[model samples]
Each structure stands twice: as C-alpha cells, then as structure tokens.
Target: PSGVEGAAFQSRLPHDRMTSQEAACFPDIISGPQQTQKVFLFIRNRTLQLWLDNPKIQLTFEATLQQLEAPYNSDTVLVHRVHSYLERHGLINFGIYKRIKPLPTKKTGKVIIIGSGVSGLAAARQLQSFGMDVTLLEARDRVGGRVATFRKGNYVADLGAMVVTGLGGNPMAVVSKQVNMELAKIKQKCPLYEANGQAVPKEKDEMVEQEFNRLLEATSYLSHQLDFNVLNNKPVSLGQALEVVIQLQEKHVKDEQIEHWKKIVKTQEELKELLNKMVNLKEKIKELHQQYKEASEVKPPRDITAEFLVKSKHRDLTALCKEYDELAETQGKLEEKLQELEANPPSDVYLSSRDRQILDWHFANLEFANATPLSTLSLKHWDQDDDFEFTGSHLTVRNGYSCVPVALAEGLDIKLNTAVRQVRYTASGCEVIAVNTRSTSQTFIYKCDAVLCTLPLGVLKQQPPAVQFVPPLPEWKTSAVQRMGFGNLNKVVLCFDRVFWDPSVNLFGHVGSTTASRGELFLFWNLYKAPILLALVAGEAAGIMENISDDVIVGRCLAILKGIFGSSAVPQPKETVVSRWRADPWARGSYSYVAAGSSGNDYDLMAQPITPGPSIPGAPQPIPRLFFAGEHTIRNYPATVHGALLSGLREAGRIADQFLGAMYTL
Candidate 1:
C-alpha cells in the first residue's frame, strides 16, 4: 500500500474494497460485533430520546467512542488516537456528505463572509446548507491564511500550524473523517539531554520520562496560574503571578531555614543601603534649608535666623526645594565616599588582571540587579554566541498540510486574486467594491445580502475609519479593536544537501559571553526529515529576523549549527525558506491575542450579522443583510482551524434557519 499503487487498488476494486455504502455501514476503527451493536443501540436510543423530548427536533448525530466501547477490547487506544487526530486536524462533531435541502424560492437575503481562511470557509459551508446564498472574499491569492506549507526538492513541510489541539469533539476531525482522510498519530520522539552539555544516554528511559513529565507539569502549572486569576476575577501581572507561585513552592522545600537565612541577608543588605542614602540625603537637605533661612532672615547689618523665609510667598518654592533636596543628597553621598576613601584608603587588591576580572564581575552583577525591573528581568545568564543543542523529537505532515486548504476548497467556487476595497450597506443589501489583481485595473461591484469577514485582526485594524464601518460600528466594538494586541512570528526552514547529525540525538543549546545580555535560537532539527532544521523566532526576536537579510539569517543559522555539531556536522543547506507573516500586509501578525485589558467579547462584534431586523430603528430589517464569520469571530475556538470551520457552518446555519426553519423539510 505505497503511493499510487494503493490508489490503483482502491480504484480498480471499488465494489469489493471501496464501496461507499459498505464503508458507511462498517464499524469504526474500534470495531467488534458487540461494539457495533452498542453503537447502533446508542444511536437509536439518543434519536428516540431527542424525539421524545421534543417531537419537532430533527436529530443529526455522529458516533462517539463511548458508543463503540462495549464491543472492542482495544477501544480505549482507538478512541484516544481518534480523539487526538480529530483535535489536531480540526475535525469533530460533524456529519459527512449529509444532504442539505435546497433553499425555497422565497428566500431573498444573501450571506457574506470576509477572509477566505478556515473560518470563512466553514461559515460558507454551513450557510450554503441553510439555503442562503453566501459570498466569501479574501485579500490573498489563496485561502488557508495562516496554515501555509513549503517544499524543497523531494520534501514538503508545513511551515504554518503543525499540530492540532482539542481532538475527538473537534469539528475539523469530523470533517476530515467525513472527507475520508485517514488521521495518523504524531509520534513523540524528542531526545533527552543532561544539564552539562553531554547527551544523556538513551537507556535511562525512566529517568528521561520523569524529567519530561516534570517539564510538562511545570509548564502546565504556569499556564494554569496565568488563567486562574483571570478566571477568578483577580487579574495580575506576569511578575506578580509568578512571584506568588515561587513563594508557595518555597514553603514546601525542605531546606527552608537555609533559604530563609539567605533571603534575610539579601533583605538586610538592601535595607542598609536604603537607610544610608536616606540619612545622608536628610542631613544635606536640612543644611541647605538652614542656610536659606539664615540668608533670608538677615536684615540690614544684623545676621539672624530667617524665620520669615518660611512665610515668604512663592508658588514654585516647594518644587524648587524638592529638586534641591535630591541634588544635595546625591552630592553629599559622593562627598562622604570621597572623605571615607581619604581617611582610610583600602589597599589595591587587584594586582593581577585576573583579580581585576573578578572585581569587574562583581560590579557587573551589582549593576544588573540594580537596573533590572521586577518584570521582564531574568537572573540566569544566557550566552548569545554559544550554540544550544535541543534534544527532542519533531514531526511534520508528509505532503504539506497546504493540501488541506485546497482539499477543503476543492468543490467550492473560489475567486482568486481578488482584493476587496470597501463594503457599503444599502436598503436592499450590501455592495462590495473589489478589483481582480490578475486582470486589468477594472473594478467590480458585488451586491450581496451579507458578507462574512475572516481577515486577520491586524489588517482589519489598519482599515481606514471611512471603510472600517459602513454605518459606523458601535463604540464598544471600536474600543475592543483598539485594545487587542497581535504578536509577530517567523519561521526559518533550512534544507541541507545531506544528513549531518545523528537521528538519535536532538540538541537544544544556549550560548552567551555574559549572562546579563544574550540572544537565543531554539532549533528543532530533523524532526520531520534528515538534513533539515526549523528555527522558530517569536515576539521581538521574530521582528529582528524579519529586518535581517536572508543571507545574514542563513549565515547566522549555519554558524550556530557549526558551533553545536562542529563544522563537519554543519551541512550546506541546498535551500532556505523564510516566512514573514508580520511583514505581510493582509496578515499583520500570527494570530489574535487578548491584550492587557480585553476579553473575547471583541471578536463577537466582528461576527455579528448586519441584516434587516427589528434590532435597530430605521436599520434595514435583517440589518445590513451582510454577516461576518472567521476565526476572530468564533468565540470558542477563535484562532483554530476547527473554530474557523465551525464558525462558517454556524453562520450558514443561522441563514438557513431564518429561511428554511430549524428542521430539514424535504
């Protein structure tokens, strides 16, 4: 069953080996007679229960692991794998090729979906099912916005989203299963390494597993801590939240007394420095005040304390006094240090350069501690120049996950090279102004009942105020848009001529001359195939990479690789591919993120329908007759492929429900 031969087998023996009817009737992966019977019984029971609960309800059900568990002993494994696949692939809780009834002749309003990403596609699919005419517009030449793939020679790689989360109940999984795409397990094979630069021997399986588990737990705990406060209506900053965890963990450690002693000493040192500054500053300020008073009190030839100086009216006197006090304190401290040195000069301890080096190190640490802020400060030093080796397994899709977007869009009508300029609302519906980039400078106007916008938040934010709203969105919606923040993400793919490092080892490494200031390159090597490496740069690092030239990036990467595995291990990559999503005009950043003081409600406005309805006065009934749907619009799965697809379906269903009613009337 390799490649074309496998396809040939299925094509030639359609009736015996690939009958749709047979496949539909066949038990799922976890198959057995009793299990099959249980599935049937469950479906029957659920269908009856739904009908009994509400006779008017039309039940459309999909099989779950619970229904098939009774018949198969290996059901657990099957169910878990299936669930994982569903979550990762963006498929779950959907029917395959379920016939949708045609729209009635009386149906008039149209549905418009903006952006052709997964969200828009899903919305279109669902809307079509509901008997609504749906129109989707994308600024890009193709859909699948963030999910992109690249190919070099014989290999194809998914450079965009590699893993799918939330399997089983995921709508994308259900869709994939219905589309007949077999889901495979992504193998976990990340290698393990000791703290001291040497590869941990592979035989210590239990120890390695325990360490991996510890890493997972620590990360999970951090993630939980982040959301706990938000969930409990007690939001805090990153530093404050992390400090709380550290304090709690400190309580549980066995060496509490020793740790407490170290903490007390550090606190005392800080307090001592603070007190010395305060005493010196207080004396200097008091002397300055006394001198000013004496000068003001002197009348004619008599020198007297100027008790009236305090009573003299001056608006800026208090401000001047504050500034003078600060300056005097600073000068006093320097004078006191000078006087101390003159009185009891310490012997020069740094006779050798090595002694000088030690002195410099101490000063450097002192400076770092004093200058660094509580937030965005790290005590650990990392080497920027040192090549870090990471030991971990990596995996990728074989044929490029790009096929996913193409496959999903296969049957749907798509207009490529179309750029939407503006959307205007009318009494009848909405008019979309767009131009075909591939053709001449001829612009076209599309009149539709609704439109679903799935474009990235970044692009939408850049929209001119004139174009941002046809009738002008509400203030809250505008505020939400302003509050959200987007992050920059970039990926560099290096393809080499031949294999360099051993497949058994994965390296994660960090290099720096001094710990205070450093940069890091987290390399995930050959997880997909030999002779290839993928480096992911995020946030500010990603912006730096975006500014650098390709040659510089490639050179830096090669230098790092050479450092880690030696020059011989650093192979000459035949090709290099970089993704600059941040620079892309259509997609300003990777995905949408909740900013410092924003919530998920902002996205809801983006998806809300503009239709003519009784919701607004003088508002064309059903509103603008233009609806929105995309990943940003989806509340539950905002930035996921499944969310996008489900949103599309949900929007379509809304349109259908309005005209066709809830139940399918054949």
Candidate 2:
C-alpha cells in the first residue's frame, strides 16, 4: 500500500514548469524594452555611440552560431574557422602550416619504403598515419639494421650502436615513448688509470667521483664552445681560437706566474682532484717503499717524471724500467716454460699442443699474418689490416643487421625478397614492375599515384644506368650523391670460456698510441660484464683486422690481455665472431657521412617528391607521383634513425595530403 501510494504521488508531479515556446517568447518579450534602453544609454554616452560606429574601437562581441542539422558547406566558413582557431591560440605565426593547401581529392597514392631499417620503419609508420597505403620492401628476411642484440646465456648484449644517445627531442626517444617501449639508464664509470696499465692507486669510489666531476666540467666547457651561431658570428677554427687565446694570455700575464695561474684556470676541477689524488698516491708510494724496505724487496717508484706526476703519478720511470726488465726476464723464462709445457703441457692447459700447433699454423696463413714482415712496420699499417683485405671489395652490413628491416615491417604489407626491376611513370600514375621471389616466379606490375623510395644511397648510386631511372635523375642530384661519402666500420667479437683477469684490478686495456701497430686493435674488454671482448677496429685498422684468421685474432687478443693483465689472465675464447660490413653486398658501407664541402641541401634532393613530366596541352592531367625517403633524404638529422623516420613520415604525409585532403597542423 505504501509503494502504491508513492507511485501515485510521483505520477501526479507537474510536467509543465517550463516550455521551449515560452522561453523563446520570453526573450522576444524583453528584446523591445532592452533595445529601447540601449538606445537611451548610447544617446547619453558618446563613447557608446563611438564604439558602435568606430571600426578601430570595435565592440568585443562574442557569438555562438549553432549549425542546422544538415551537411556541412561553405569553404570560406571552414577556412575562417580554422584561421580563427589558430589565431586564438597565439600559434598563428608558425610557418609550418602556412603553405598547406586544401586537402586534395582523388585518393590514389601509394608509398614504397625500402630496406625496412629503423629509418625505413619510422618513415613507413609516419606515412601510414597520414593515410597513405605503404608497401615496405626488405631485401633480408628480418629488419633492424645495425641495432643488433645477441643473447649469451641469460643476458642480451647489443653488438651495434649499444646506446641510444640524445634522448631528449630525439626522434627515437619520441617514438619509443609513444610506443611505450621500456628503456634503462646505463651507469657510466670513468676512471683515471696509471700508465703502468693499472687503475690509479686510490679508493675506487673517490676515483669515480673525481672523474665524474671532471667530466661534467669538461662537458660544460665544450657545450659553451659548441654554440654554432655564436661560433659562426666570428667563425674561427678551434685550433686558431686556441692559439689566439694563448697569445692573448701571454701578452696579459707575466711568464713567471703564468704556469701557476694556468694550472689553476686551465686545469679542470677533475684534473685538480686528480692532482690531489696524486699527492695522496705519492704518500702511499712512500709508505709502500718503507714497507718494502722492511722486507728488503723495495724498488723505487718507477720512472718518476714531473710530467708523470702531472699526468699519472703511477708513471714512474724507475718502476717502469724495473717492470720492463722483470717482464723481459719473465718472458724469456716463460718461453722456456712454454717449450717444456708444449712437450708435456700441464693438465690445466685446456687446449692440446696438437690443437695449438694447428691453430698457430692457421694463424700464420691468415689474411693478417701473426709474424708477417709488415707486423713491425709503421703503426698505420697495422690499423689498416682489416681494410687492406677489404680493399676493392664490395661492402655490406651483415645479415644480422637486417633486424632493422624486420622491426620496420611490423603492421605493414611487406614484399620480402622482392626486387624492383623498373619504375615507369604513365599517363594516370606510376607503374612499378617488381619480381616476387615467393612461389609464382611472375612479374607483378603495381600502379600507384605516388611511390616513396627508401633505398640505400649506395644501391641508388651503383644501380646500373638502365635500371636507375625512367628518364634518368637530374644531373645535380647525381652530382650531390657522388660528393657524399659512406664510411665503413667493423666489429670483432670474442667470447671466452672463463674470466681470467684479477677482479680487483681494472686493467681492461688501452688504446694504443699512433706509433704502436699492435695498438690498432683498440680493444674493448669486459663488455657488459660478460666473458666477452669487442675489438672496435675502425677506418683502415678495421680492414686489416678483417684479413686475420679467427685463431690469430684470438691469439692477439690473448697476448694483449696478458700484457695488461698478468700472463695468468689470458683466457681462451670459446667462440669468435667477426663482422665485415665493408664486404657485404646489400649495404656497401655502414652509413652516409658528409664530406668537406657538402651542405644540407645535398640531402634534400633525396626527400623531394617525383612527379610526372610537364603535361602537354593535349595530354591528360599528369598524375603527381613517385617519392623518395631514407636517412639520406633527411637533411637536418641525416645518417641517423631519426632522420630516416622523419623522412619517411614527410613523404607519406605529402602523398596523403595530395590525395585524402587531410591537413596537418604544425
């Protein structure tokens, strides 16, 4: 009964407290009186009258125009609305969107992104977002060129371009964030070491702190110097600027006090910290000498030079000579020991003498000889070993580098193992004739309004004249391509079975001076704390290293490690992997580089869209078609993953805007 009563009460509520017609009528009712009062007020206030008549003192009137439920129309209304919105935001002055025309009709544009590397993938993704149908072509089975990662046990090690630098405003950073990819910060350790191939004798924590502070100061100084516009204002070479600064200081400062002042000014805080560290080290050395004297086995702190103290306090001439003599004696004894060990090697010798002999024999015949007459030649010759073997040989990135191409092909229709034989522009659009390697063995012709090419610069340049262009590329474009350079880089990976170095001493290795031929290896040890070391032999040095056999590489690596770490520290690697990008076919070299006189404009040509030839009066409307995108196409960030991605997006956007009429606001 109570529920029924409540229902009855709700049903009887007033339904007509307000009506739409009444509200409309109410506004009209007040309009007449309000209009009359406004006129009275304007007559009394001259300012109000002036405001009504004066364009300069226009009324700040706001209006809300409700559109009828009908199809949208009026181009001017659309343009005015967009322009007004832009102006209100205070972004109207930005030039990025100024040249964008009304979106074109005729949805008939297609893009072909070549290579499928990071650059290609970035371009493909950007282009796809712009509504262009993209077909990514990869020569390899997978992608991710140069950004290679290998798994050993449970750990993943990056073999190429390990670190993604310039994270802020970096395109890769932006894309990685957008895609929600996880990234980890790497802890950088910088330590000053003694020339004795040992860690600077100090607390590790203190050395690390000092080094970090010193690095920060150096970076700050460099950052100020790198202001391009400021440098451009006067434009002086770094060498010339340094000379000028030195001259000015000499004129203003007294000679006797110059060194003292220079030490205070020129020396970075880190260097000062290091100097303090050396003072502490000298005291420690004196203490050690006293301790050694007690045991009657003390030696003078090796080769102590004034410069050594300034550089590395551990670089004592006396200590060095003693160490060298001791090393020579040990080596002579070790040779005898090795001969005896060879005849009846210790059980601890993992490799049999027979195997060692065979390895030694193979090492002798390697492209890089272990005991070649040239081994003692100029240091430059050693660095160029890898390059020497690769001379006159066609170059390419290893198949593993195809990881770049793989990552790029995700979510896109990729034509893998397909070759484009010819591209011809027709009356309607461009026709691409390609041979698909899968099954059919049939040649397929694809008709597209636009085509974006993301081929490597080397491939484009070396393309046979007949296969290159329908009417041939412009002479200027060809000339620009010729002037640009592509350099080669090689990596030699060695994986040992065990850790052989003393854990307490961080005697990883050293970069040999220009005069040291053996130093050409530029050995990088204890990578990612793995039983692995990577020898980054660059330029001509890389070429020379490539010629050497795996056995020789292992032996040399062992010898170098022994030199740094004690002979007992020599560990034989279980596996050795050598990468020779300089000899690969798909990639002639690593990436493009700017030569002496080349400017940004040279790269712009790679981004420019290819359109149909000028139409004759009688000819049908020539379809605007064909485009190019790649790292080379990117002008500002050329030869980087960011450049490639941006370029791809640019080409795709161009094609999409040409057909879909979709506008991109800056």
Candidate 3:
C-alpha cells in the first residue's frame, strides 16, 4: 500500500519463515500490462499521520492499493523477496496504521484469526490494514493469553510470565511506553547460601561472582574470546558449556596458588639462616658495647678494633634477622592454607555434591531460561538470547503488561468467550465453527477467505486436538508439532502484608537441592510495590506443583525462604497464589522449547499452512486457506511475546503478498 512493489513481495511467505521459490503461484491475483504502475505512482510519496479513528487518512491509502490491485501479482523466491521489502520498510505500528488504508471493501478479502494474543492481534492488525476484514477469536475470558497479569486487591502478579525480557526492539517495550508509564526494571542480585543454612561469606561470595561471569564469558554468545564455531555457531546448553569454563578457571587458580606457596617456602628457609647468624654474632658486639660505649664514648681495652668489627657485623645480622623472623612467622600462618589448597584446591568451579544444592539449579536456571531442562535442550539452538542484540534492562510492567495486547487489539473485531471447535475451508468459503463457552451446544460458523490459527503449541499438541480440521492437518505438520517441545514453567507468588525481607534482595536460592526441588523455587524476584515475592519454578517441577494443594505449595516455599533467608528472619506470607499452566485446557503448558532432536526447521514445519485439503477432490483446491501464527511458529525468537508478535506480523504480510498482490503498509 505504501507503493511497496507487489513484485518485490515474491518471497516473504510464512510457509517456511523464508521461501519455496519466486512467489509463482499466488492463488488470487494477477499482473503485467494491466497495470502500468500508475497505482504505485499515486501512493508512492504519500505520507499521512493521524489515528485510525481519523477517516480521511484511511481512505487515501486504501484508494491507492485498490487502484494497484485492480491490475499483476509466488515461491521460495516470491516469499523471500516479500521479506526483503516488507521488513525493510513496514512495521506494524498503530502510529502508521492510523494513517493508511488498503483497497475498497468490495474487493478486499477477509480472514479469521484464532487467539487474541500478541501474535493473533499482530497478524489481525496488519491484515486489517490490507483492507481484509479480520475477526479475532479469543478462547479465554481475558485478551492476553500467556502474557497475562493478575491483580488481587491492590497487589499485582504476573502469573503467566513477569519479565518483558528484551527492552530494545521488543513490541512490549514499545507498547509499554505508548500505553502508560514506563515499565520498571526488576533489579537483580545473586545471594548464595551454604548447606548449613548460612549465607556465604563475602570473600567466598566473590568467588561465586567471578565464576558466574567466567562461565558467561566463556560462551561465545556472551563473549568473543571463545571460538565456538566447532559447534557451528550454535551454543550447547549451560550444563555442557558452563563447566568447561569452570575447569579452565580451576586450573588457572591452582597454578597461581602453587607459585605463591613456593615463594613463601623459600622465604622461610632464608629467614631461618639469617636468624642463626645474627644469634651467634650478637653476643660479642653486646659485650663490647657494655664494656666501653655510651653514645659519644667508645674506644676501650685492646683498642677494641676486633670488637668494633664484630659489633658492625652483629648490627647487620640483627636487621636481616628482624625481616627473617617476620617472614618466617607469615609462612607459619600460610602452611595451613597451602596444605588446604594441596588437598582440595581453590577454584571458581565447584563439583556437584550434597551440600551445594544450588549448583543443580544454577545450571538448571540457564536451561529453564529457554523454558526447558538441560536433558532435552537442543545443543545447537541455545544462543538466540545473545544474538538478537536487544540490549537494556528487562522489566515487568508493574501494574499490568497486558495493556500492550489490549492496545494492539484496538479497533479490531475480536470475539471473546468463543472457542473454535473445527476449521475447514471449502470451495465456497473457509469456515471456522466455534461455540459460546457458556453455551457449548450453540455453535456459530464464521466464513472467510483464510483462517490464521494462532493456537498455542501446548493446545495443538493436546491429544484430542483443540480445533479439528475438516479432513485433518497434514502428517508432516502433525509430526513437527509433536516433536518440538511445549514446556510448563509456572510461578508461586506469595504476597506479604509488608516486605519482611531486605529491600535490596532480588534473587536467592538454596545451596544443597537437585534440579527438581531446587527448580521448584529456582529463584525469587521480590516486589516492593505490594510486598510480593515471586517464586518461579519450572519443567518437571511445575508439572508436579500443578497437582499439589496451594497450602502445601505455600508451605514448601516458606520452608525454602526460611532456609535461604533464615528461620528467624523469615515471616509467614499474608497470601499465596500459584499457576497451573498445564491444567488449563486452552494452554496445555507455558511456552515452547526446542527439543534435542528438533531444529529450527521443525518450527517452520509447525507453521506450514495446510495446503488446501487434498485439492478438495474436484474443485480447484481452494487457496491453501489455512494459516498459522504464534510464538511456537517462529524459531528465531520462540517462547517470547516479541516472537509471537513477529510471527503474527509475518503471516499477515504473507497473505497480503500472496493473495492481495500488495504488501500491507503496517
């Protein structure tokens, strides 16, 4: 619509995140001499700035796209070109969408988007700008799905996921700024504990600090010093990569401490000899001095020449012996330290054992950072967090982060409390049948040009399948959906009447537990706004907690807090709330994760639009009317709100390029 060439949109299809060829087989468009590029010329330099609520700006943009589409318009080649141009120019910003419009409604196509999440909203907004009548279907009572934020009285809790991980380049970051006040950064600190329930000493804690950075720096993602090309630029999980750096650190410290012992031992020897010589010579010098001298009075019997020489030698020996004794005493004190180093050695790395439980979680935390555990994480796909380059403090929208999705959904047609039961596209129309959640038997049919299903991976992977296709989804697509992992990482939030702990504490963990129990309360993010503490647990641990009673969950977390913060210092929580993501029918689990055998291609496969069901036998196989979009559908930034938003925007761009013969301006 912004004069972006339809011919240039040949390759940005959502089919594979990139292309299959030049988009050669667009189902519903045409081009060539029918268009002399007159339509593009008219819209080329037009720039209008106003709200979508403003009518005139909308008319101008749509008038031009219709003029262009009234004319010529696929493949890896087609979708790829679409990527180059659309990404290079368009961004789905409300600031821009307000100012543009697509073709006239008569010729414009319509699409149904399942889910009102960031991805669904993102896709719908862009498609709407393309003049497509977009209907957003929300299965949940609320708008935001996994991006939810809950409120209890005045206390706020992000039970879904609290942190908006990447500030720069994040859709949430942009929306947070636009919707309300800025997001507050959750300042973090690491406080380690010992097995005896004692906080680690300051010096020992410094070792933890050094080792933490060493492990992070050793990974190519965090530092350039390491050449991880052997891993093909893909980082292995923390359990594999972090230990190597610690081993390297151990050797460095061991070597350094050995050298220090040699210097101490050698000094002990020299000091001993110097002390002996001084003892032997000092008697004669003292006798001479006692017999003859006082200040200015000196020479006495036998000229005292020999005695004078002895006195001077004694003085020299005494001074050297003074230094020797001091050095010798210091060595005596160091012997215990040297012997200790010899037996156990000082190192930034600590081997696994019963006492230091945090070790398991320390590594597991990194594993869970991807929403999976070390055992199944893909060694090759663990570095997106670093490579994406979204630098800045990550934050939690203090009041509620869901406003971003709420804003993105503005002006869009959204049907809430309507759950889709089946999706089938036929010769006449793409039909989506859903029933009111309150009235299950009363089903409504929504017919449109295309159906973009943004169902969460967890929902898709469910045995019964949330939405049944007319003939069913393809085998390859089903296979991919089954392979890639959908994980659960729920949180147990404990709110207190007042902050009973130190204000500066951000993160605290036990020194002694396995990845399971240790993972339960992996870490805590203390909130001052409502004196709330968020205990994030995940993987197998979260699944188990899903069955446990709230009292037990709160009690277990309390026991942990007492262990970490100490019994006397710990106070009973005023209230407790927990999340059971796996128990939710609409969301079987929390987020997406790459499994050991799977790769990025599997994500592309899960995203593959079901090519019109078996060509519908006779009628020209309706334009592969089915589509997909969600965080799970994208690998580059999967398991994130930003990823979900990108996927949605991407699919809308796909339909615009392939079906409408023009890219949506936003």
Candidate 4:
C-alpha cells in the first residue's frame, strides 16, 4: 500500500515532530502526480531525441523547455538542493539518503578547491604558498578542462584551446616567457580556394583585401563608396545585417544611378538627331558602342541567431530560384544605369568572391581571440580592456596547455578523479562531499576553513549541477552566474602523411559556401613542421555538431577540403581528433562571455564571498566562508587563461589577508 501505483505514505516515528518547512519556504512551488509524470516523460523522450541529434546542444535545453520548461528563479535553488540531497547518503537509486549535517573537523585552516583547471591549480598553488592545507578535486579522470591535448603513437595535437593569445605581460605570456614555451610568428602563409578547387582569382583577391578594411570602417569599398554604416545598440546577426545592406544598396545608390544613366542616354540620342551628325556620338544608328564592359560574377546578423540566416537546407527549389531571378533582374537594371553615369569612376569596386572568403575568415579570426561568435559580441564593448598592458603575439604551448596545470600542481594535494557533489558553507567554514567520478564506492568528506571554487562559468550555471550548494548561493552571486554567457568552440585535428599548399602560410580559409557552412570550415592552420592540419568551428556551428559521429564529421570536413584543394591532393587522415567542448560534461562549453545586459562588474562581484554572520563585536566582519576564482571572475579578461591566472592570485591574496595572522595553518 505504501509504494503502490497511486502511492501512499506510511507513518514514520519522527514524522509528527517534523516542521512544515516546505510549505513555508516555497510559496509558489508546484508538485503533483500529473506534473511528475510529465517531467519523467520529458526526460525520457528528450534523451531519446538527443540520441539522434547533438546531445550537447543549447538547443536541447530549448527543446525540452518548450513543453514544461525550466525555471529562472528560486525554484532552481530548491531543485538543486533536492538534487544534491538525492546524490548523497547512498540513498539515491535503490534507497534514498538525504540529510543536512555539519563537517567532521580536524580543521586547520584547510581549503578544498574544486576543479583542477588553470584557475583551480593557480588558486591551490597560491593557497599552499600561504601554508594552507589545500586539496584540489577534479571531476574527470584528468585535470585541465579546456586545455586538453591528445597523443597517439608519434602524433600529438591540441583539441582544447590550441592558440595561446596575449603575448606581452598577460599572464599566459608571462608564463610562456618563464617556461620558454615554443614560439612561432607568422609561421605559415595562407592561400585561398574556390568550391571548384581553383585558386581564388587575383581580381577577386584584391576585393578580399578591401572587405577586411570595410569591416573596420563605415564606407563601402566600391568605386561609388556607398555607406556601410551598421552601427547599433543591440547587435544583429552578421547574416541578417548583410541582407539589410543589400536592400539599402539598391534603394539609395543602385536605383538612383540607374535612373540617371538612362536619362543621359535619352538626351544623347536627341542631340544626335537634332545635329543630324554622329559627331557627339556613335549615338545615332550611324555609330554604336557598348555602354559598359560586362562580366559575370557570383555572390552570399547576430542575435539574433542562425535561425535567421542558417536556414534549413531543405527548402522549395522553385521559390529559391524565383528569388534568384528577382535578384538578377534588379542587379541588371542597376548596372544599366551605372553605365550612363557621367561621373563613373573606372576603379569599379564590388565585393568579389575572394572578398567573401577573406572577410568571413577575419570575423572567424576573432572567434578564437574572443572565444565567442561575432553575433554575441557587442560593437560598443569589444575593445574594452580587462588586461593587456603586456599582451603579445599568440603562440602554441609546445609542452601542451595541460602542462601548465600539471606543473603548477607540483607539491599540491590534488585528488585527481574526485568529483565534488556538494559544498555546504556556514558563516565560519564548510563541508565538501565528493565521490570518485569513476567509482561510486569511493567517497570523501573534506572539512576546510574556506572553499575556493574555480568552476568555469558554464559549470556554475548548470541547473542540476556538476556540483550543488546546500544553502543556495547569494542572490548577487547567482545573478552574476546566470547573467554571464558561456560559449563553445570546437577544433578538428587531422594528421596527414604530408602537407599541401605553401608551407609559408599558417592560416587559410574556404570561402563562398552556404551561409551556415561559410565560417564552419573557417581557416586551416598548417602545423607545417608537424604534418597536421587543424580546423576550428565556433559558436552555434560547433555546438550543432556535438552528436555527429566521428566518421560523418570527418566525411563532411573532407568534402570541404576537397572543394578547396582538389580531391587528388586531399586524402584520408592517418589519424583524426575532433574537439567538442560543448559535449564535454565537465566543460559544458568553451569559455565565458560578457553578456549585453551585464559587464565586468558582474565578474568582479562573482569573486566576492558569501557571508552573513553578525560582525564580531568590535572586530571587522569575518571573512566569507566561500570564495571564487576563475576566468569568468576577471573583469577584463573573462575568457582568457591570463584572466584565470590573475583571478587565482587575487583570491589567494584575499584569503591571506583574512586568515594568515589569526588562524593556524597545516
């Protein structure tokens, strides 16, 4: 009767004494058998659907949400608390154990740092410098969330964050200079190609150069120099912005020029008729000449989203063709008018095929530098400096990005495979509960004076969580975490027996494809000396491919390459590696983004500790029991390793300022 289909609760010894906490705590919470069924059905169906498409997509969240949806308020905190309770006590699954308890303490000003990425390691190393008993926990079998490198046989490649940005005094640069990391500048020259496997034409090539300048300026590169002013408050997807420009070009510039030219032709004809001579023209039937030189050319927003530009490949060919016809007619009528203009400049500037390739790559170039898509980037705030008084040229970490974490981990007590489950902090201290991610039998309880949680923004924003807090985080901290944007960037590494194209160029782009596919191929980096080619896909494009099988992903990549460099030269790679940061549970996405509604202040506040104990009688307010350090906490450098490094140092110093004099260290 107790565990039947309808369900009934049995009498318990302490039930009468328990307080009515839930009714008081959550006034708006909803729960019922009907809703419970729906939730279960949603999860089961969602899981099956993800089995077909990408499981790691942000879209997956949307898909599941369209029905019952997730909450954006206190419900999440309650949900997380419930989830955390279920995970502990070995009461989950077979039986359920749920309780709130204090720590088992030998507390010696110990610290439990979650995550072993650059930030975690940095914080731990610094805390140890203060002689604190520090233990770093990593969820995955290994450390280094985004700085992952793979080694197979004689070949090696970086899948997570291959390029190291900021050359000078930036933290990464400082470390590189110290470690003497392998450095290369303009290591190779890049070449462009068409879909038909021909080298990009020189005339078109010149146009590509112009577009690069166009991106940074407000004028069109054409002979008429039309205004390309697209400045705005909210960013539009680059795709929709392009569409808007095409229409403006016709109405303001193209249509007017055409009308003027046609008017001139009529006047010239009348003058010839009146003079009864061909003197002024081949204008009469006596003399004739082509008005303009005609040649053929081919042509292709931010949240906004790709849904605006990246249309489904499946569409009506009849309608698509009709649209093309209308476009061609408009273009022809405009060209006719241009020929008649008396002020026609001969330089004739138009966006060429090569221009499309170059401009797309230039924008693609920034995705890695900023670690986000141009659509999400604000035109107003891109250059705002978080750091870089010492920035320098980008380089590769020869020892691999993971090596920095490994090296910094020296002399530190890092528990490698321990996945932290929950962190319960009080005004004075905290208790950390963890289990070996690979083995449930191994669990741990670490009591410490403070906790420096260096979890990435993406991880911190998760609903159910890779780690949950007992008493929900403060409203300001939760708001900061939710407002921050997390992005995904994926890399595909291919190892070849040999390399094609010039060895002098390091970056090349595949241009003039469908809008969705244009930047997907992005640029290819030649590890010239290494005989490997790396291709990077960023933002939604990368996130979409998470569930694709390796063979399918490789096949798609190969087709793009063959389009660029001829099938004869392109061959199956001896080995392959694809970086799907979005698919990685520990990472969730690549890096943090400064959302439009938020700024560096959110990051600054994210690092602040949560504390609510009455100030000691005459003493200053006691230190916060929980502290934060990560790239997301750095005001200027939200996504860079240098930001992560500096944040770790900042928190370490604060912890020292708080406890070093008064507390005993291990």
Query: What's the TM-score of every candidate structure?
Result: 0.58, 0.51, 0.68, 0.66
Tally clashes: model 4: 26
Query: How much is the lDDT of residue 647 in candidate 1?
Result: 69
Ordering by lDDT: 3, 4, 1, 2
C-alpha lDDT score of every prediction, in listed order: 0.51, 0.47, 0.65, 0.60
lDDT of 2 by residue, 1-666 (tens): 123222112212112221232233233322446543332222212222222122122122111112211122122343333333222211121101212233235424576655566666665655554446777766655566555556556333455554444453243432443333335443344232222355433464353344334433343343356532124344322223333443543444455355444444443443455455555656666765554444433344546553344334334434644654555555455445434534552234322333322222222222122112222211211222222121121211222233343444556677666666677765566767777556437777777666667767767767454235676666777787785555555666777767665443322334343322322454353444556556655544655666778778767666656666677766667667666665555565556654323445677766676566654657766656767777777666655555566566556555555666533221
lDDT of 1 by residue, 3-54 (tens): 3232222112221132332233333522446545444333323322332222
User: Which ten-residue region of model 3 has the weakest summed lDDT?
Assistant: 44-53
Query: What are the RMSD figures for all models against the true structure?
Result: 20.2, 24.8, 10.5, 26.4
Comparison by TM-score, 1 against 3, better one: 3
The alpha-carbon lDDT assigned to residue 35 of candidate 3 equals 35
Task: Give the alpha carbon lDDT tens digit for every residue of 110-216 in model 4.
Answer: 88898888788777766665457889988877776677877777676778756666453344543553344566654534566656666777776666656555544
Candidate 3 residue runs with Cα over 4 Å from true position: 1-92, 95-107, 194-197, 206-356, 564-571, 613-622, 663-666
Point out where model 1 deviates above 4 Å. 1-109, 179-184, 189-235, 243-396, 438-441, 463-467, 502-520, 525-531, 603-606, 611-624, 663-666
